[PDB]
RNA sequence: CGCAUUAGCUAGUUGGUGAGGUAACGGCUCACCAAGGCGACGAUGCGUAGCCGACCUGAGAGGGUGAUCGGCCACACUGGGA
RNA sequence: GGUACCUAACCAGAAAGCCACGGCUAACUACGUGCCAGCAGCCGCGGUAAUACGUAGGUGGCAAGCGUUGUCCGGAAUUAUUGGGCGUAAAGGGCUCGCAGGCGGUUUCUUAAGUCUGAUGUGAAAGCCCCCGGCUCAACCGGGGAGGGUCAUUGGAAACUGGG
RNA sequence: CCGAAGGUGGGACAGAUGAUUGGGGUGAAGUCGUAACAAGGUAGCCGUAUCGGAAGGUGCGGCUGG
């Protein structure tokens, strides 16, 4: 996975950083630095859907089933789907600040183990409910990658609280979608799966 | 004839048993007369749930349980209530 | 119309005809009758492999193999890719695909089938036309 | 003939709207009197008056064009036609233009409106949409 | 403990010609699954007249019962209105 | 009233047809664009424009679209009540929707309802699919809409005597 | 549930009395009489089909399906019998 | 069955393909071909400057799947009850008299078949749905509830349809 | 006594197949005319009869969709 390529095609900083669009803001390829045409309704809905699913790295089976389960909840639809992909556990690891991307946070949940409320979680797609103190076991207590991402100081979002040494990540009420992402346009993705 | 017997529910490797008033004729997962609650074996502890009064109602019309259902009745304590009723 | 007229004559629903009917039947050998099986594919033996032409403005010579099936029906099928193995009396598996250009032909010979070999020198559209992933 | 007079009074009001007439004489059966009384008390009409006579009676309707040229009644409809009668249960009573219009629904306690029959929790014939 | 009540209809006599019996058109009538309008159907039952006190065109009640012969499962209750 | 066009407008187009006229010499072509124009605060309009070129057609269409503007009630970011707009064998129903749905509409209907500022529409075209008559049908359905405040003012009534 | 380019179909069929038979009511079986019975609200005939809880699609109304699982049915190389 | 499982050691080492790229429909260039070979669901491509054929690069879609086929349903308001029509686009019987059927002006009393409402039983278990729980999450399991009858009995209403 | 099967018989329905045949469709710039579309060079069409290689013609009645 190149994943610079995904960002410059989608036209969005999918990390959210000065990287990956500076020096080359066009899409990819031999048909990229020329003036591309604007996309249709279909293309705009695909752009926004794949902005979100390439933020979080989801296949469309999980992405569609979370769209459906978010529809089974209450409120506004596209907000609840953002909320469910910000309860996803790779996102929890990268927003506690334990990795520099979501691939590194994927490898933390997959094998470089990380723990929720006890025993373990080997699964990136684990939806994290509130109230759940997320930390690492005493084996991987402070190793080089989590150590670097502790040395580097990001902001903790207000739907999280994170400690450095004890490293337990605890929660608050719910991640409001004002807090989640400014760039991704929800309710074009609801319209993309409305058809 | 009428027998209070376990009835298999659940996944493959994880069984579950609804304690179910059926006939000896009828199939095990098949048709049945009424049910009392449940039986989790695969819990590492206990956790049986018996209705304890409708089970008692079926015991007195004449319905003799199987061995494991009988000792579940003993664990919740309905066979002692049945013996107190026969001593009544 | 009126509700009483809808009650005593009803709405008669429009007829459905299948686009490929020779797949839409079958055959048992001793009962000597012609069952409705609705099958996706049928193998049959080639009765005549030639080539012939379309009708009007589109003018390029097509491929045209005629096959008698396991239900008993001879249909002219089509051999899609470039350069085909087939002879007369060849075992052929047939899928339903309309060939608009050549008239009277409404099935494809599945390439990669029982005897219809995968096509030669092809790398794009691998699964269609039958050919294996060659080497790299 | 005439086959139902309720639909005919509803079209007579609708044609008087589209022409923007100001008065209507309608031959005034008792259910018509209750329909025009409901449409009076819901402000679709300026006023309605009865003429009790020998032949069959007359009910006169005064259509309300409240502002510049604004048909307060935009359209009428008859739901239960004599040939497909419509009956709604109380948990199926229809609310129309969701709240902004109304449905004359004659339940078991009086010829009611929409909200009245919903709050009295009975159902019956569903016999006019009024927008 | 009063026992369970048997089914009862009222109807209209079609024929008198069978020995000690009649047939009875019950005109209960009902609506569709789809169009909703309510249409009519006439159901003629075989019913026993042990006194044969019936006429064609007679409104009559019938009781259901044990099967009295082939096609018979009904008997008289109260001959309400006589034909003119 | 006629909505005075001094706003910020977004002016995106539906179609440009290439549109012929036969002369002694032969076919002479023009481009007929129709463009929907409006801010997303409740003012919509659309207009046709014809020229030998594509960009002059889009110019004339955006001018004639700014001339005729319509208003739409945006009650709770939806429409107030379900309506069918029926301009001439284009018939389009419009339902209000819940807050999450997004504009459920086909191409030119979607352009009208997005340039209206209405965010949650169930809608469906129940007639012919030319863009011109469908846009006329949508604006017919949005002209006949009614505000609850205005209908309460119409019945000699109050709003809460309607809404409950 | 499909066909009216299937309109007439029944004669133990439709009733009676009596008998036999059945775990039981009954033309279920038999004697003797009566001319009944079903019918365009579709009899009969032909074609198709295990029925359902359910399953798929659909905004829904519907349309299609009747695998698994579960209920009832019918069958056991074909027909008949105990 | 020393099976799920837990614990230690080692190496990015063993592990990605399929389809499409004219429009619908996201995704484009180049070389060869020259109405041939061929593509195609449709509009239709290709007759020496082919983004439509074959290949390469690229991109896009998905992803241990992907594509084709066969049938269902939707799209299709294209059987229209919801929800269509008949002057000229398909469609008013050539016209009448009329049986059955359907529909029925007004006031009032009464009835309660239709209609609405209540109670009771029931529409098994699983399934869809809601709420919680357990499988490392998920699928799935489990618990608890809901739903679904022109259903039967029973009790109220009387506006409307029907009955007198 | 009943009775499955089998036997004989005359019908009924349904599928094949059959010398030959009749209309239909589609097809490489085939042959004969030019009936219709314009006042289409005889206004056309509808019904019906009749004749004629063929489109068609002619009669009668009707229609404007002159």
Short mmCIF file of N, CA and C in Angstrom, two decimals, chain B residues 22-63:
data_model
loop_
_atom_site.label_atom_id
_atom_site.label_comp_id
_atom_site.label_asym_id
_atom_site.label_seq_id
_atom_site.Cartn_x
_atom_site.Cartn_y
_atom_site.Cartn_z
N UNK B 22 -41.53 -32.84 26.73
CA UNK B 22 -41.80 -33.45 25.44
C UNK B 22 -42.24 -34.88 25.66
N UNK B 23 -42.55 -35.57 24.58
CA UNK B 23 -42.82 -36.98 24.68
C UNK B 23 -41.58 -37.75 24.28
N UNK B 24 -41.54 -39.01 24.70
CA UNK B 24 -40.46 -39.89 24.26
C UNK B 24 -40.55 -40.14 22.77
N UNK B 25 -41.78 -40.13 22.22
CA UNK B 25 -42.00 -40.33 20.80
C UNK B 25 -41.36 -39.24 19.96
N UNK B 26 -41.53 -37.98 20.35
CA UNK B 26 -41.17 -36.84 19.52
C UNK B 26 -39.65 -36.71 19.41
N UNK B 27 -39.15 -36.10 18.33
CA UNK B 27 -37.70 -35.92 18.22
C UNK B 27 -37.17 -34.94 19.24
N UNK B 28 -35.84 -34.95 19.38
CA UNK B 28 -35.20 -34.26 20.49
C UNK B 28 -35.31 -32.75 20.33
N UNK B 29 -35.07 -32.25 19.13
CA UNK B 29 -35.19 -30.84 18.84
C UNK B 29 -36.56 -30.49 18.28
N UNK B 30 -37.49 -31.44 18.27
CA UNK B 30 -38.71 -31.32 17.52
C UNK B 30 -39.85 -30.71 18.30
N UNK B 31 -40.99 -31.38 18.23
CA UNK B 31 -42.18 -30.82 18.83
C UNK B 31 -42.22 -31.12 20.31
N UNK B 32 -42.83 -30.22 21.06
CA UNK B 32 -42.84 -30.33 22.50
C UNK B 32 -44.03 -29.59 23.08
N UNK B 33 -44.34 -29.94 24.32
CA UNK B 33 -45.63 -29.60 24.92
C UNK B 33 -45.56 -28.22 25.54
N UNK B 34 -44.59 -28.02 26.43
CA UNK B 34 -44.29 -26.72 27.00
C UNK B 34 -42.85 -26.77 27.45
N UNK B 35 -42.30 -25.62 27.81
CA UNK B 35 -40.93 -25.52 28.27
C UNK B 35 -40.87 -24.90 29.65
N UNK B 36 -39.84 -25.27 30.41
CA UNK B 36 -39.37 -24.52 31.56
C UNK B 36 -38.03 -24.02 31.05
N UNK B 37 -37.23 -23.33 31.87
CA UNK B 37 -36.31 -22.36 31.29
C UNK B 37 -35.12 -22.94 30.53
N UNK B 38 -34.02 -23.27 31.21
CA UNK B 38 -32.76 -23.44 30.47
C UNK B 38 -31.73 -24.28 31.19
N UNK B 39 -30.60 -24.47 30.53
CA UNK B 39 -29.41 -25.09 31.10
C UNK B 39 -28.20 -24.72 30.25
N UNK B 40 -27.31 -23.94 30.83
CA UNK B 40 -25.98 -23.68 30.28
C UNK B 40 -25.01 -24.67 30.88
N UNK B 41 -24.55 -25.67 30.14
CA UNK B 41 -23.40 -26.42 30.63
C UNK B 41 -22.11 -25.64 30.48
N UNK B 42 -21.91 -24.96 29.35
CA UNK B 42 -20.57 -24.60 28.90
C UNK B 42 -20.06 -23.36 29.62
N UNK B 43 -20.86 -22.79 30.50
CA UNK B 43 -20.35 -21.83 31.46
C UNK B 43 -19.34 -22.54 32.35
N UNK B 44 -18.23 -21.88 32.65
CA UNK B 44 -17.25 -22.46 33.57
C UNK B 44 -17.79 -22.62 35.00
N UNK B 45 -18.66 -21.72 35.54
CA UNK B 45 -19.53 -22.10 36.67
C UNK B 45 -20.84 -22.79 36.27
N UNK B 46 -21.79 -22.63 37.18
CA UNK B 46 -23.20 -23.09 37.32
C UNK B 46 -24.02 -22.40 36.22
N UNK B 47 -25.18 -21.81 36.57
CA UNK B 47 -26.22 -21.16 35.75
C UNK B 47 -27.19 -22.09 35.05
N UNK B 48 -28.04 -22.72 35.87
CA UNK B 48 -29.30 -23.33 35.44
C UNK B 48 -30.43 -22.35 35.72
N UNK B 49 -31.47 -22.36 34.87
CA UNK B 49 -32.69 -21.58 35.13
C UNK B 49 -33.92 -22.47 34.94
N UNK B 50 -34.58 -22.78 36.06
CA UNK B 50 -35.78 -23.62 36.04
C UNK B 50 -36.97 -22.81 36.52
N UNK B 51 -38.12 -22.99 35.86
CA UNK B 51 -39.32 -22.21 36.15
C UNK B 51 -39.87 -22.50 37.54
N UNK B 52 -39.72 -23.74 38.03
CA UNK B 52 -39.80 -24.14 39.44
C UNK B 52 -41.23 -24.16 39.97
N UNK B 53 -42.20 -23.73 39.17
CA UNK B 53 -43.59 -23.92 39.55
C UNK B 53 -44.38 -24.60 38.44
N UNK B 54 -44.07 -24.28 37.19
CA UNK B 54 -44.73 -24.97 36.08
C UNK B 54 -44.08 -26.32 35.84
N UNK B 55 -42.78 -26.41 36.13
CA UNK B 55 -42.10 -27.70 36.21
C UNK B 55 -42.73 -28.58 37.28
N UNK B 56 -42.99 -28.00 38.44
CA UNK B 56 -43.70 -28.68 39.52
C UNK B 56 -45.11 -29.08 39.08
N UNK B 57 -45.75 -28.25 38.26
CA UNK B 57 -47.09 -28.56 37.75
C UNK B 57 -47.06 -29.76 36.83
N UNK B 58 -46.01 -29.89 36.02
CA UNK B 58 -45.92 -31.04 35.12
C UNK B 58 -45.48 -32.30 35.84
N UNK B 59 -44.73 -32.17 36.94
CA UNK B 59 -44.30 -33.35 37.67
C UNK B 59 -45.47 -34.09 38.30
N UNK B 60 -46.53 -33.37 38.64
CA UNK B 60 -47.60 -33.98 39.42
C UNK B 60 -48.65 -34.62 38.53
N UNK B 61 -48.77 -34.19 37.28
CA UNK B 61 -49.68 -34.86 36.35
C UNK B 61 -49.11 -36.20 35.92
N UNK B 62 -47.81 -36.38 36.11
CA UNK B 62 -47.10 -37.59 35.80
C UNK B 62 -46.20 -37.34 34.62
N UNK B 63 -44.96 -36.99 34.91
CA UNK B 63 -43.96 -36.73 33.90
C UNK B 63 -42.61 -36.89 34.56
#
